[PDB]
Design a protein around this ligand. Structure first.
Ligand SMILES: CC(=O)N[C@@H]1[C@@H](O[C@@H]2O[C@H](CO)[C@H](O)[C@H](O)[C@H]2O[C@@H]2O[C@@H](C)[C@@H](O)[C@@H](O)[C@@H]2O)[C@H](O[C@@H]2O[C@@H](C)[C@@H](O)[C@@H](O)[C@@H]2O)[C@@H](CO)O[C@H]1O
Ligand SMILES: [Ca+2]
Ligand SMILES: [Mg+2]
Ligand SMILES: [Mg+2]
Ligand SMILES: [Mg+2]
Length: 142
């Protein structure tokens, strides 16, 4: 059971590197359009263990994180073998779930057991692969 407000919208975001103009803030702009050409999808360099993070600004009790994958270019696969991690205000892990793939689905809903965290991080565990997210939405436990 989760609230409906997406508390990641408009928050500070960052990522391991930036390529092709794909600013980290594109995953928290309020627009889940998955076509990279419509400018709302992030992109890091091709690198090992690429990551992306949003700072919620305060510790919140997180119940759901929703990832929206890139959809154009036949490169949706790059979002595979990754972790979704929640960190506290000291940047220590308070929760971690691993996923092998989204299975062609355009989105992934990740549920957390009422976890108090300030940061939400997506981490690829693959070599030489860029991280691109169309949007990451985060909802409080109800
Ligand atoms: C190979 C590469 O990175 N080329 C860049 C380019 O992106 C490619 O553009 C073509 C059409 O010309 C296709 O849409 C390809 O799918 C696309 O390559 C994909 O997307 C890029 C961003 C990378 O992730 C890449 O590895 C991948 O295969 C890019 O073109 C722009 O962005 C694309 C998606 C598209 O909307 C274009 O029409 C657009 O102008 C350009 C300019 O940003 O940069 C190239 O280096
Ligand atoms: Ca977006
Ligand atoms: Mg278009
Ligand atoms: Mg344009
Ligand atoms: Mg910060």
């Amino acid at each position: 059971p989760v609230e409906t407000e997406n508390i990641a919208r408009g928050k500070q975001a960052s990522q391991s590197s930036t390529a092709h103009g794909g600013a980290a803030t594109r995953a928290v702009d309020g627009n889940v359009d998955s076509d990279y050409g419509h400018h709302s999808v992030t992109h890091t360099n091709f690198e090992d263990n690429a990551w992306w993070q949003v700072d919620l600004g305060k510790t919140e009790n997180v119940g759901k994180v929703k990832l929206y994958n890139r959809g154009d270019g036949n490169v949706a696969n790059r979002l595979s073998n990754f972790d979704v991690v929640l960190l506290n205000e000291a940047k220590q892990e308070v929760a971690r779930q691993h996923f092998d793939s989204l299975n062609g689905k355009a989105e992934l809903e990740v549920f957390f057991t009422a976890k108090d965290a300030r940061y939400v991080k997506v981490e690829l565990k693959t070599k030489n692969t860029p991280l691109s997210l169309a949007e990451v939405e985060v909802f409080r436990s109800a």
